[PDB]
Amino acid sequence: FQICKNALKLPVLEVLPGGGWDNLRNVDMGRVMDLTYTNCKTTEDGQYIIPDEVYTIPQKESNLEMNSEVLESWMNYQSTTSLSINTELALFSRVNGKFSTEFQRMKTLQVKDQAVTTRVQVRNRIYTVKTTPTSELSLGFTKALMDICDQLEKNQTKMATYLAELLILNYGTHVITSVDAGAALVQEDHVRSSFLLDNQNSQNTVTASAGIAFLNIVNFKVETDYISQTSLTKDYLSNRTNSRVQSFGGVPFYPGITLETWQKGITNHLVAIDRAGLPLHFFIKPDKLPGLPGPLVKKLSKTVETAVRHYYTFNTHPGCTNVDSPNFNFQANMDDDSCDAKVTNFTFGGVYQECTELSGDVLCQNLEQKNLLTGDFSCPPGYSPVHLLSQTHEEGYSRLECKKKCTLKIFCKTVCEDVFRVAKAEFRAYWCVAAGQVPDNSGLLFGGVFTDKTINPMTNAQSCPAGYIPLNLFESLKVCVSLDYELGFKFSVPFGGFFSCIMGNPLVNAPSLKKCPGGFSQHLAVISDGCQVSYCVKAGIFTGGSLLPVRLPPYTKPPLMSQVATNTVIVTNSETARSWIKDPQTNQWKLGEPLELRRAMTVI
Amino acid sequence: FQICKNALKLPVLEVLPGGGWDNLRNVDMGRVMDLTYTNCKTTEDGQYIIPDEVYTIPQKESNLEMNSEVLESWMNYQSTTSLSINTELALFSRVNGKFSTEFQRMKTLQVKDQAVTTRVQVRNRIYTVKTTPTSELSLGFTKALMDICDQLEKNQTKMATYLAELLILNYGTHVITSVDAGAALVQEDHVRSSFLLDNQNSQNTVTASAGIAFLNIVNFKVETDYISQTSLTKDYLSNRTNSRVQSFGGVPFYPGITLETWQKGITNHLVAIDRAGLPLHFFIKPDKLPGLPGPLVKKLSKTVETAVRHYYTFNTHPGCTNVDSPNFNFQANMDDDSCDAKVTNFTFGGVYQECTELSGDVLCQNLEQKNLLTGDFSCPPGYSPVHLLSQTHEEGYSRLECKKKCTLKIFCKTVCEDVFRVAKAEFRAYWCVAAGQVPDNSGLLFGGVFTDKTINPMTNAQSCPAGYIPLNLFESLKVCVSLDYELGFKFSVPFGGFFSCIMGNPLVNAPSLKKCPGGFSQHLAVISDGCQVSYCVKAGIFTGGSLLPVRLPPYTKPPLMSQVATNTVIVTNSETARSWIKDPQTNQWKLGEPLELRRAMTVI
Amino acid sequence: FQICKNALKLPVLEVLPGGGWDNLRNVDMGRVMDLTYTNCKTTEDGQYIIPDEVYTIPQKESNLEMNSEVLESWMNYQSTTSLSINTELALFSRVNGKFSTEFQRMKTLQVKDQAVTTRVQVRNRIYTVKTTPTSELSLGFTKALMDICDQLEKNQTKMATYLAELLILNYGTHVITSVDAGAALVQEDHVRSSFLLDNQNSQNTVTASAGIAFLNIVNFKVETDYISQTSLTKDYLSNRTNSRVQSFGGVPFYPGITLETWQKGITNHLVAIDRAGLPLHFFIKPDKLPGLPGPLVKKLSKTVETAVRHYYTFNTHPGCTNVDSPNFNFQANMDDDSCDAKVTNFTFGGVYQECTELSGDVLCQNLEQKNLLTGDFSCPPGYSPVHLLSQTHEEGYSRLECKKKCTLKIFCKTVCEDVFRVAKAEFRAYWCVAAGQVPDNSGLLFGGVFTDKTINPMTNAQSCPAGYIPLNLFESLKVCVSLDYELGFKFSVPFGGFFSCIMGNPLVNAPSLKKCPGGFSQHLAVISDGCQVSYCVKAGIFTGGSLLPVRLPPYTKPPLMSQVATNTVIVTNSETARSWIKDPQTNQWKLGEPLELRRAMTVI
Amino acid sequence: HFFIKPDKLPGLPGPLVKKLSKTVETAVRHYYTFNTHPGCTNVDSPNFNFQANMDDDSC
Numbered sequence A, B, C: 001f002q003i004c005k006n007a008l009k010l011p012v013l014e015v016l017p018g019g020g021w022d023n024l025r026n027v028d029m030g031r032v033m034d035l036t037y038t039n040c041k042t043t044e045d046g047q048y049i050i051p052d053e054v055y056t057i058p059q060k061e062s063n064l065e066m067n068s069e070v071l072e073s074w075m076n077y078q079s080t081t082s083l084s085i086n087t088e089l090a091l092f093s094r095v096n097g098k099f100s101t102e103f104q105r106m107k108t109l110q111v112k113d114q115a116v117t118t119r120v121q122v123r124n125r126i127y128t129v130k131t132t133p134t135s136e137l138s139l140g141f142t143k144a145l146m147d148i149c150d151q152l153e154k155n156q157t158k159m160a161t162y163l164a165e166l167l168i169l170n171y172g173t174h175v176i177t178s179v180d181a182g183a184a185l186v187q188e189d190h191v192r193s194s195f196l197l198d199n200q201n202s203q204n205t206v207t208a209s210a211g212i213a214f215l216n217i218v219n220f221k222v223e224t225d226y227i228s229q230t231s232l233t234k235d236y237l238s239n240r241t242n243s244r245v246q247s248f249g250g251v252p253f254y255p256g257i258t259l260e261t262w263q264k265g266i267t268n269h270l271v272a273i274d275r276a277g278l279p280l281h282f283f284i285k286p287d288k289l290p291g292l293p294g295p296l297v298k299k300l301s302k303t304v305e306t307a308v309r310h311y312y313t314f315n316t317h318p319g320c321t322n323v324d325s326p327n328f329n330f331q332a333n334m335d336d337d338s339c340d341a342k343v344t345n346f347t348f349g350g351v352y353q354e355c356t357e358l359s360g361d362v363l364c365q366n367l368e369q370k371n372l373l374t375g376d377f378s379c380p381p382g383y384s385p386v387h388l389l390s391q392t393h394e395e396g397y398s399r400l401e402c403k404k405k406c407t408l409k410i411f412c413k414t415v416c417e418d419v420f421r422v423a424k425a426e427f428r429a430y431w432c433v434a435a436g437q438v439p440d441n442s443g444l445l446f447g448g449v450f451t452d453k454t455i456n457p458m459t460n461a462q463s464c465p466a467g468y469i470p471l472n473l474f475e476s477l478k479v480c481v482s483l484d485y486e487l488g489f490k491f492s493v494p495f496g497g498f499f500s501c502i503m504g505n506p507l508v509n510a511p512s513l514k515k516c517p518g519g520f521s522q523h524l525a526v527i528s529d530g531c532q533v534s535y536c537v538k539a540g541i542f543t544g545g546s547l548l549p550v551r552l553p554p555y556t557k558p559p560l561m562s563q564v565a566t567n568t569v570i571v572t573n574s575e576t577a578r579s580w581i582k583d584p585q586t587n588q589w590k591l592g593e594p595l596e597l598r599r600a601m602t603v604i
Numbered sequence D: 001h002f003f004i005k006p007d008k009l010p011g012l013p014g015p016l017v018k019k020l021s022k023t024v025e026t027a028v029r030h031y032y033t034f035n036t037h038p039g040c041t042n043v044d045s046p047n048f049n050f051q052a053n054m055d056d057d058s059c
């Protein structure tokens, strides 16, 4: 786009709608649109140039909120940088933006201080920039798309999902279509809930005081002299906690910039104020990719959909988030009435595993372990076996076969042959529940849980407590269970249930959703081939504390190539008489009846 | 248009009438007009150039409303950015602009604070820019039009509607014809209804105080000194809540800009102040598209009409919106006298489903489920079966058939054939109503509802309450029904009725409109192939709370190609002796008698 | 990139996401991306140019935190220079940044003064710069990658791990993908915990005082006059310890720079504010390196993974870090409930070694030593032998063989032949534990430990205490054990247990994790061929004191070439029919069936 | 001594470079031990050695 800047001496449009966007991480991950500047299309005013596949409608509407916008609960989270994306009725609208760099701070300021958040935003959005419907894709994005297509062609349903998760990590969860270019001047003013409970009838005065304080802090730079200083403003400042005036656009903010010099500061600076986009799985349509065939593009879109879904469900964590309730879970984003649900107590029953291995019995015996009570895969008397996960495990083993041909024993040289013998071993995890009123003595007491990735919240380290035996559940899931009841009673915590991605725990009252009852705090334990297993515990002190970080894709190490690579040179549909033949090129699909019939007669 | 800027050193007209416009989202979605600058046609003053297919009549009328414009109820919603579009007698004039970024804030400020909105607008509209009647269409818009035409040609009545909904998402619901270029300076000053009830005879003084406060806040930048400061102004500021001075045009606003420097700021900035346009389905006329045939263009216009209708009815939600009434529904946009209607109570009867599948019985048994009371598709004694939806469901299944030809067992290679076996399974949902005075013990109690898309407002999460069995209605509609009466009485809520897009519930008193009686709050449940099904519940606390977000098109995942693609090379009319023959090109329709008769003799 | 600076007179983007990043050392080690400037791609504003394989999304969001951010405990460590990397759920998220130049100072200020840290940060991040997914690698990084590949090809599994550790030392542990270019103005204000315990209800005032003090120190440069000076500010300054206003970006900070001149100072200066990247072992994918084969790249990635793991576990040290507890370990980064664990006391049992040498018995007898009590490899009565390490040791011996051919005894000249006879000697270390209640008289008392690398914390020098015999454990591990009980009782310290990388000590209660019980402080002793052995001691005064420095890779001297170099010209997979043939070039892998079958028939 | 690796010097052979690195290592060691002097460095103790750098509990 440098040729257009040379021909037209004016800065390029700063924020562009072309490119992927992540709802959780709250950042634009990658570029999904090519956005060529072959023709120097500019904004209707001589200020910014725009790519050819993007049109802009200049709104240039500047608002001056004289009073603050109060957010009582943080479940809504009317976000600043993206209000039209964190609000859509997506797969999960509640956790649409609950992992942002802004919402994390807002949450740690709202629950740890019992203080609602009030913002005084001055958003002078300049351009509502939008993508042209007939826009192409960027070379990197379409290259990753074609790579996922070729990997779905080679019957690698695990490697294709892994590459889709990598694409989401590199291109977000939503393709931005609309974006409100402009600037913002927000003061995320958190104020105690008791200040609103004492001024519920005078909330208008609270909002007015917040707004005038924002205004006089922006312009004056002097804290001893402000405008409209009253007693209620002093009480507001006294009940005020963690004030921060954040200018999302324009020249970087300081308490000295008069709002005239701030609004005039928007001449080159134009940041996304209200970006709105559709999910990327919906963006990849059969007409969007001309060379790639229709049904294959639809299968790839379904793969991207299920990968975005695995991203969402693994990222979000269900649990009550009511500040006053005792079973309040701080880490949870999406809240159900678990804290309000009747509290109970369950006795854990133990876990065992089965080995079904090809060869080399040393590797599956590591993941295989028996019960603590009985010592065998049989369920303890009085409990019911519940299935958790039925998938295969494999790790690569590098073997090199060397045969040396040595003449006169001085020309001796070693030449080898690298062989990678990936061994697959089926593994299944089972855990039982007290379906009957069995004695609590037999009831194993859950003491904690840890693997090499997460940290045991009870011990604050990747370690097994004293007196407990580590039980390897799948590969590295080390559950710590008490060999006896009393000596491990003070340290341990009542169990909540083990539920996985395919099958849930029966503890919720015969339908049983993938959740733990009795107001127990749920946490993730292990991810395995795009499937999660979760542990739930009593809502104690260790359930809260720190905020859970954002889990990022991919959710598995690169799956090894167990299946052989396939070349689906011919693609067919049973519904319609539509086919697609692969040319000698890598990705060049063309319609032809003779070639199709010939290659079909050859393959079958 | 850069050649005209080089030849004539002056900025281009900022806002243009060419382009689509969405009534609900309140933004210009896409460009429907080409707007070529082949001839450098300018405004009659040397300030802005205009496209060749657009003429402008300069009004340059500047108004200074010294007093505010009060809006008692928000049902009218005289919008700021578009007053001539949100007022037309369209398909739904009440919800014409009820999903705007402005109206949402106005509503949350009007009902949550019981405060009417008053605006002091200074709209100096400069140019009443209008489109030439003999104007062509943009390449992207006409390309999407031709795509919808070709898809209606291939007998894909579902994919064509999906592409029409996508076009509406990309080109809005109204093609703008007139637009009032200019700037605005509005103060959306919300003031309590009690302040107007106490000053009903002195509303003129309230409006004067609002206007003078707007004026002295715009110019002075000093809050301690204003002009015409009286006691009534102080009472107005005391009863004032969420003031915001929003300048829709010109240089971005700040409390320091004297209105002289604001009005002089309009030299390059020209935003749409009063945009007026006709719906896009009416814009696509037989004479608008020369190559595309007449009756096919009319069928495409009817498709766009029904798609805009599906957009509207799915977006809008009917329910009483009277602040004082107990059955007030906050989310509802269009209001009938439901809250004033006589309150009742109905006992829910249960839902069952039928499977009619081609092959592979595993997929339809997921959507098929029996009654909770009886356990069979038979209606419970004393109830009447009511039909909800009769449409087919299908999901794609990717199957690849591989036959390997391996010589010496070392040249072994796998070559497959991608086959997509879309399986269609007819599904029908039925729910019964207590036509007679049946016991309430048998009457199933509605506990809530959720799918993978929406969120259960009772549980605030996508989850089934404890003690309830999830009932899959169509694909993912998981209704939670109580197995017993008492234990689930405190959590559940009296039912309101299930009504779908094709058939409504008989609960409204034998004609039965698609609505729920007794002042019950209505909400959307599932969209399926452009058809909506709705659930209605007692107007409790959970019905209000947050405002319902804007539902966006398309209202279904891309429908799979079940029907075979067709090439209607010949098009005929039974009324008139008019035909249209397809040339070897993609879209090139030409009149010819010999070609028509020959190809007709060949096809039939 | 100088051609783009000549064509476009503007500074290059200062911080770039391309390049490796070390989590522990908290610095960008090396460059992992080539970042060519073949096309002069610039930022969307005329301020900075960017490499072709890097795109930037300008956020330009400037925040002004009016109140401080309090960190009660230093276990979370929300870092300033990298908040999105020290938070990810990596192999070890607790020690993700516990070896930074910032965290070391924060720790020595937090525990030695019992003072929590509060920061008032002004981070005006300008560009969220990100790497293109289809980006190549830098010549040096890909050269080191190819070197590790060739060394894994030559069956040097130790030299390959050594080169991987060297690469991590030269390219960090994480490949940066996202980076928030900008500036920061942070005041790491440490304040006593008693000041927060006395103002727990008034923590908002403490944060406000910290923020206003930051603001008035930044701008005024005069310490006698500040704004908003109250009594609580004076109490804050009285309880204040080690204040430091650190500007991470922009023009270097001084108390005179008004924040206007600081924010305006960001025109060329752009430092990483929030850098986010994935681990480098995950960055090296089969598609990232085209020439290098797939399974070999996967094996190299596993080698880099295990080398990063050895870096992490050797760097981190587990031990309780609770300030109030008596068993507080200052050096420990990751904390378990060891201090809270029941305190015990164990009697050390002694160490012996075995020699299994090829030839030249002088070298293994140095590492071999018998027990002090018994004087033989037999375990003392009442103890249980525990294995520590089973690996081979070797050191190079240079021998030159000279035979002189001298004519007339005056032409006499010496010509030799350098021969390097690396001698490998197997060595095993065993140490016993009092499995039974043996007398304490026989129980050897652990007096200390030292080698040539670390320093004995009891003697503060590499020396053996008087009256103790040095016991060489592996090569240089000189454990000092008491020959008697009483005379060495005052100097010595109760033992905690010897646990190594492969096998742990059985002192933790038959599973025994690699840890020491009873709240004993753990320290590293010796690293040997990528394996660590650790000694644990009673949590006394000498366990704290100074902070442990950062252990840096490689964790072994260059392993001698014991195994012969191999040329795996052919690489094969047993799962898929995929192979890779080496061309006469160094690293040029190409697919061919005839060449593969021929060379396979030749090698086997 | 660690910087001089077999790959750092291409012309010079591997084992000879390793022997030279061991020579540089032992020379740096002779530099260190000859430079440093062990002795107690506690100001209050009577046997305080001022010249000593590294301190053991000799005093």
Ligand SMILES: *[C@@H]1O[C@H](CO)[C@@H](O)[C@H](O)[C@H]1NC(C)=O
Pocket: A155, A156, A157, A563, A564, A566, B402, B414
């Ligand atoms: C394709 O992958 C699936 C899933 O692992 C497997 O069941 C099937 O046998 C594979 N087919 C071929 C031809 O590799």
Ligand SMILES: *[C@@H]1O[C@H](CO)[C@@H](O)[C@H](O)[C@H]1NC(C)=O
Pocket: A195, A235, A236, A238, A239, A240, C201, C204
């Ligand atoms: C909040 O304001 C009330 C009003 O007087 C005051 O009594 C109270 O002390 C304030 N709280 C704080 C924490 O300053």
Ligand SMILES: *[C@@H]1O[C@H](CO)[C@@H](O)[C@H](O)[C@H]1NC(C)=O
Pocket: B155, B156, B157, B563, B564, B566
């Ligand atoms: C066209 O579509 C309709 C609606 O699905 C269907 O009834 C009809 O059989 C189809 N005709 C052809 C020729 O595909």
Ligand SMILES: *[C@@H]1O[C@H](CO)[C@@H](O)[C@H](O)[C@H]1NC(C)=O
Pocket: A201, A204, B195, B235, B236, B238, B239, B240
């Ligand atoms: C509104 O104005 C009346 C007039 O005196 C006053 O009594 C009342 O307190 C005001 N309400 C608020 C909320 O300030």
Ligand SMILES: *[C@@H]1O[C@H](CO)[C@@H](O)[C@H](O)[C@H]1NC(C)=O
Pocket: A402, A414, A416, C155, C156, C157, C563, C564, C566
């Ligand atoms: C390769 O190295 C391994 C590990 O030291 C050794 O066991 C094996 O014998 C070596 N093979 C060759 C051919 O050098």
Ligand SMILES: *[C@@H]1O[C@H](CO)[C@@H](O)[C@H](O)[C@H]1NC(C)=O
Pocket: C195, C235, C236, C238, C239, C240
């Ligand atoms: C901390 O502040 C309190 C409040 O008066 C004061 O009593 C105390 O002396 C202060 N501590 C220090 C170390 O200045």
